Design a protein around this nucleic acid. Structure first.
Ligand SMILES: [Mg+2]
Ligand SMILES: [Mg+2]
Ligand SMILES: [Mg+2]
Ligand SMILES: [Mg+2]
Ligand SMILES: [Mg+2]
Ligand SMILES: [Mg+2]
Ligand SMILES: [Mg+2]
Ligand SMILES: [Mg+2]
Ligand SMILES: [Mg+2]
Ligand SMILES: [Mg+2]
Ligand SMILES: [Mg+2]
Ligand SMILES: [Mg+2]
Ligand SMILES: [Mg+2]
Ligand SMILES: [Mg+2]
Ligand SMILES: [Mg+2]
Ligand SMILES: [Mg+2]
Ligand SMILES: [Mg+2]
Ligand SMILES: [Mg+2]
Ligand SMILES: [Mg+2]
Ligand SMILES: [Mg+2]
Ligand SMILES: [Mg+2]
Ligand SMILES: [Mg+2]
Ligand SMILES: [Mg+2]
Ligand SMILES: [Mg+2]
Ligand SMILES: [Mg+2]
Ligand SMILES: [Mg+2]
Ligand SMILES: [Mg+2]
Ligand SMILES: [Mg+2]
Ligand SMILES: [Mg+2]
Ligand SMILES: [Mg+2]
Ligand SMILES: [Mg+2]
Ligand SMILES: [Mg+2]
Ligand SMILES: [Mg+2]
Ligand SMILES: [Mg+2]
Ligand SMILES: [Mg+2]
Ligand SMILES: [Mg+2]
Ligand SMILES: [Mg+2]
Ligand SMILES: [Mg+2]
Ligand SMILES: [Mg+2]
Ligand SMILES: [Mg+2]
Ligand SMILES: [Mg+2]
Ligand SMILES: [Mg+2]
Ligand SMILES: [Mg+2]
Ligand SMILES: [Mg+2]
Ligand SMILES: [Mg+2]
Ligand SMILES: [Mg+2]
Ligand SMILES: [Mg+2]
Ligand SMILES: [Mg+2]
Ligand SMILES: [Mg+2]
Ligand SMILES: [Mg+2]
Ligand SMILES: [Mg+2]
Ligand SMILES: [Mg+2]
Ligand SMILES: [Mg+2]
Ligand SMILES: [Mg+2]
Ligand SMILES: [Mg+2]
Ligand SMILES: [Mg+2]
Ligand SMILES: [Mg+2]
Ligand SMILES: [Mg+2]
Ligand SMILES: [Mg+2]
Ligand SMILES: [Mg+2]
Ligand SMILES: [Mg+2]
Ligand SMILES: [Mg+2]
Ligand SMILES: [Mg+2]
Ligand SMILES: [Mg+2]
Ligand SMILES: [Mg+2]
Ligand SMILES: [Mg+2]
Ligand SMILES: [Mg+2]
Lengths: 190, 137, 76, 57
RNA sequence: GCUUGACGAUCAUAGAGCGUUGGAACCACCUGAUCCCUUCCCGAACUCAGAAGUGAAACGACGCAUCGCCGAUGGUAGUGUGGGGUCUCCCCAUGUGAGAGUAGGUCAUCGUCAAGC
RNA sequence: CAACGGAUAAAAGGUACUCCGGGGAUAACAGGCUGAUACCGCCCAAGAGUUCAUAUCGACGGCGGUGUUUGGCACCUCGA
RNA sequence: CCUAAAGAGUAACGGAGGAGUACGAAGGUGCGCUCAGACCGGUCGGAAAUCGGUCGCAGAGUAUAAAGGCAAAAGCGCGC
RNA sequence: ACCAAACCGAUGCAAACUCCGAAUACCCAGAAGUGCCGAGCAUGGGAGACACACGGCGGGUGCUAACGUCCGUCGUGAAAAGGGAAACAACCCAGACCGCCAGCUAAGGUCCCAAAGUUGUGGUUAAGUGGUAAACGAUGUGGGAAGGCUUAGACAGCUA
């Protein structure tokens, strides 16, 4: 369940933050958004990493319990160690009932084995992007955009404008006059 | 053997190789990647030799990306030659590698088949390597 | 080797910095081109040298359109 | 208002800046103590040469 | 207190793009080339003499963040001093601290004078 | 007067027949540091081996050892 | 110009390029004007000449290398 | 059916690229204190020296080889003894006016050679690791967070 526990962070800087990761096993974090001042918090490393193997971790709303108070936020950005890969810093964006928010939503490709371009002409699938940028009110934020490739002939290109979004969801990039390809079917490599 | 088609200058200083790779450390194109954990530099004969070993194992579908380009010329002074009298001629091209840099990527194959393919490539490279998948962020 | 040539260094740069007291005729900046433009009380030489026509204090302000950098002299 | 400063390490091999910082408080030899007033200018020479001095406060 | 015109302060949070809108006075377009003046040809530009027309264009005002431009907090990189290590590189104590990105902001704000309302 | 602070207006070579003052401030031999090179091992395994990667070999690449060859440096020795 | 470590200066038989001139107007001053390039239409030239229009703002130019500059243009034209 | 300027989006690199951009260093002004009683500057008498070495940091060259070579900036030696690093110019501590059969400390140390804890508490190692090493290999062993099966019978064995 999408729950996080955080404690208020008072000591800042490089020396204090390097101590949190080394000694206490914690992670610094930020809570900005809404109409409120940013608040600095810290949370356990083994708990933030436990939430991050859910598929809809960044596409679902979280109830972050800070000390004894509670509030509704969404994972906005995430910093990772370039070599080891563990999370080093995370910032949350507050959620307001009447306010549009942007998010990164993964793509589920379905019935690939049913694709026409594969059985008949012996093609190959190549997903080009596995996520999109959306913009919707928090009441109708989707967990995943489902892309269907059953009826795709060999050599066909699937763009953003070819898929279907739920009620009240915008594709951002499409709105800006740039519909970049999602997937394709191509002949075998050799 | 990769090398630039043409360069502005023929030679370069040795320089230094410091820091980590905060740029070029994500799986951008494929779904599984080979990441670098130690620093060093790949000599464009290792990059080719590790690509041959990787595509030969799969040899059924799939797509493969190379994310490292060797674009730093290095020289050697011939044998039985004193010190000085100019700078030596260019011998080969290398790519500077920092910890965390992603080297190869692949998709269109099984998750397990990627592991045997990257283990065959990792044995031809003079640095420690890691296997990573792609995350949303 | 077919490379061993260079030229003597010309000692260019800012000679008097901001807040300093100038006397008339003092040389302020030595330049190639006009990296600094002459402001109030400052003249330009025939090799883009900034000197002082009055006495006072170096200012070093950037202003106006084109985003230039001006050297001027203000009352001490 | 007044601080006790004692030199506890040698001045051999230090930077010329740090030698001048210890000499500016009045210290001459090891285990010498001096009672200097607690001014920001004096406090700034203690902090520049903190690793050589013991401050009793 | 408002509109117009001239001169400045400041150089995009001040720009570009889109839409609406003004002619009583001012301005522009405008009429004509006798006269002053002009075109390496030409009244296009410059100049002169004006008063039938029109706010079409240009210009001013008012709207919209679409592009541009500004832009936190937090974290990260680097770094002076002292000390360490497995020493081509990094770590600790202390001081300092970006660039990029994110939340967001922006369709400016003033002075003098002259004609009117 | 470009050998560009320009020795004179005006100037090339040989010495194994050689000579003096000096130098390990500087070379040839041997010693030292290094280890590109050389030699000896090891890692991965496409392939050869009728089929079978490792009985025997082993491409393309990688990691070391020894001071052992050709070198690099010029630390000792030119009152041997 | 880089090395050169954000004041100056800074070495190597280090990495790259130029000079040993030109101009009586290519100098002074007053007045006037903006480029390269793309696209559209147009008699032979035709991808590219001369012409008209739209876009553009310096991707042009600067006697001569490169660096730093250039709208009061330091760029281009004319009279004296 | 190969190739495709140009544009759109993602994605790396640069000593001789820059829409940006520090810490230090540097220049100036004003202030308290300290200075060995001076520091600064000027003018005169006398010089020596213009073969440098290594260690740390920033670099070129070499093979990010050399007790290699060439620069910038600190420290030491040169011209510096004493204690430590077994011995060991250049490393760490510390700068010797003379005498004492007095005490306290620095670096480094406290079983015997050989001065001082066979000191106290909680763990690890079985390799004489400590007391020389790399890719790579291995049911060596300690700690930690989670998983997959499992009395509808799990894993090894054994019978079809
Ligand atoms: Mg720090
Ligand atoms: Mg180098
Ligand atoms: Mg980078
Ligand atoms: Mg040279
Ligand atoms: Mg040169
Ligand atoms: Mg020089
Ligand atoms: Mg003049
Ligand atoms: Mg001394
Ligand atoms: Mg010292
Ligand atoms: Mg007219
Ligand atoms: Mg910050
Ligand atoms: Mg900061
Ligand atoms: Mg910022
Ligand atoms: Mg001569
Ligand atoms: Mg000479
Ligand atoms: Mg000279
Ligand atoms: Mg002779
Ligand atoms: Mg002879
Ligand atoms: Mg002979
Ligand atoms: Mg003789
Ligand atoms: Mg002799
Ligand atoms: Mg010698
Ligand atoms: Mg000599
Ligand atoms: Mg011998
Ligand atoms: Mg020898
Ligand atoms: Mg000997
Ligand atoms: Mg076979
Ligand atoms: Mg050896
Ligand atoms: Mg030998
Ligand atoms: Mg030898
Ligand atoms: Mg020498
Ligand atoms: Mg001899
Ligand atoms: Mg003898
Ligand atoms: Mg003898
Ligand atoms: Mg500097
Ligand atoms: Mg400089
Ligand atoms: Mg020198
Ligand atoms: Mg020449
Ligand atoms: Mg000119
Ligand atoms: Mg034309
Ligand atoms: Mg102008
Ligand atoms: Mg640079
Ligand atoms: Mg350049
Ligand atoms: Mg005295
Ligand atoms: Mg004297
Ligand atoms: Mg000399
Ligand atoms: Mg000398
Ligand atoms: Mg020297
Ligand atoms: Mg020397
Ligand atoms: Mg030396
Ligand atoms: Mg170097
Ligand atoms: Mg060095
Ligand atoms: Mg190097
Ligand atoms: Mg030496
Ligand atoms: Mg060395
Ligand atoms: Mg040095
Ligand atoms: Mg001597
Ligand atoms: Mg000594
Ligand atoms: Mg000793
Ligand atoms: Mg020893
Ligand atoms: Mg001893
Ligand atoms: Mg005692
Ligand atoms: Mg002790
Ligand atoms: Mg004893
Ligand atoms: Mg005991
Ligand atoms: Mg032992
Ligand atoms: Mg041993």
């Amino acid at each position: 369940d999408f729950i996080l526990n955080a404690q208020v962070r008072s000591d800042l800087g490089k020396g204090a933050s390097r101590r949190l990761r080394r000694n206490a096993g914690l992670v610094p974090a930020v809570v900005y958004g809404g109409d409120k001042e940013p608040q600095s918090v810290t949370l356990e490393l083994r708990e933030i990493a436990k939430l991050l193997e859910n598929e809809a971790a960044f596409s679902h709303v979280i109830a972050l319990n800070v000390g004894g108070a509670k509030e509704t936020v969404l994972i906005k950005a995430l910093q990772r160690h370039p070599a080891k890969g563990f999370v080093m810093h995370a910032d949350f964006l507050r959620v307001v009932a009447d306010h549009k928010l942007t998010a990164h939503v993964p793509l589920h490709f379905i019935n690939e084995e049913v694709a026409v371009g594969v059985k008949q002409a012996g093609g190959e699938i190549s997903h080009t992007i596995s996520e999109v940028e959306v913009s919707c009110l928090p009441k109708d934020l989707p967990e995943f955009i489902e892309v269907d490739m059953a009826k795709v002939e060999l050599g066909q290109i699937v763009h953003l404008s070819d898929l279907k979004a739920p009620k009240g969801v915008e594709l951002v990039q499409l709105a800006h006059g740039n519909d970049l390809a999602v997937a394709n079917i191509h002949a075998s490599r050799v | 053997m990769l090398q630039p088609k043409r360069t502005k200058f023929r030679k370069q200083m040795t320089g230094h190789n410091r820091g980590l790779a905060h740029r070029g450390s994500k799986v951008s194109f494929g779904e599984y990647a080979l990441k670098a954990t130690s620093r060093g530099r790949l000599t464009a004969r290792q990059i080719e030799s590790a690509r041959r070993a990787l595509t030969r194992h799969v040899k059924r579908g799939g797509k493969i990306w190379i994310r490292v380009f060797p674009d730093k010329p290095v020289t050697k002074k011939p044998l039985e030659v004193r010190m000085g009298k100019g700078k030596g001629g260019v011998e080969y091209w290398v790519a500077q590698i920092q910890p965390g840099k992603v080297l190869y990527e692949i998709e269109g194959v099984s998750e397990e088949l990627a592991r045997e393919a990257f283990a065959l490539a990792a044995a031809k490279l003079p640095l420690a390597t890691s296997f990573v998948k792609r995350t949303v962020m | 080797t077919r490379n061993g040539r260079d030229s003597e260094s010309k000692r260019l740069g800012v000679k008097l910095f901001g807040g300093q007291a100038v006397k008339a005729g003092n040389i302020l900046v030595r330049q190639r081109g006009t990296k600094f433009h002459a402001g109030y009380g400052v003249g330009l030489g025939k090799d883009h040298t900034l000197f002082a026509k009055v006495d006072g204090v170096v200012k070093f302000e950037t202003k106006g359109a084109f985003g230039r950098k001006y050297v001027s002299i203000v009352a001490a | 208002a007044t601080v006790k400063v004692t030199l506890v390490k040698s001045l051999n091999g230090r930077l010329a800046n740090h030698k001048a910082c210890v000499k500016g408080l009045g210290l001459r030899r090891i285990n010498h103590t001096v009672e200097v007033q607690d001014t920001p200018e004096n406090r700034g020479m203690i902090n520049k040469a903190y690793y050589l001095l013991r401050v009793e406060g």
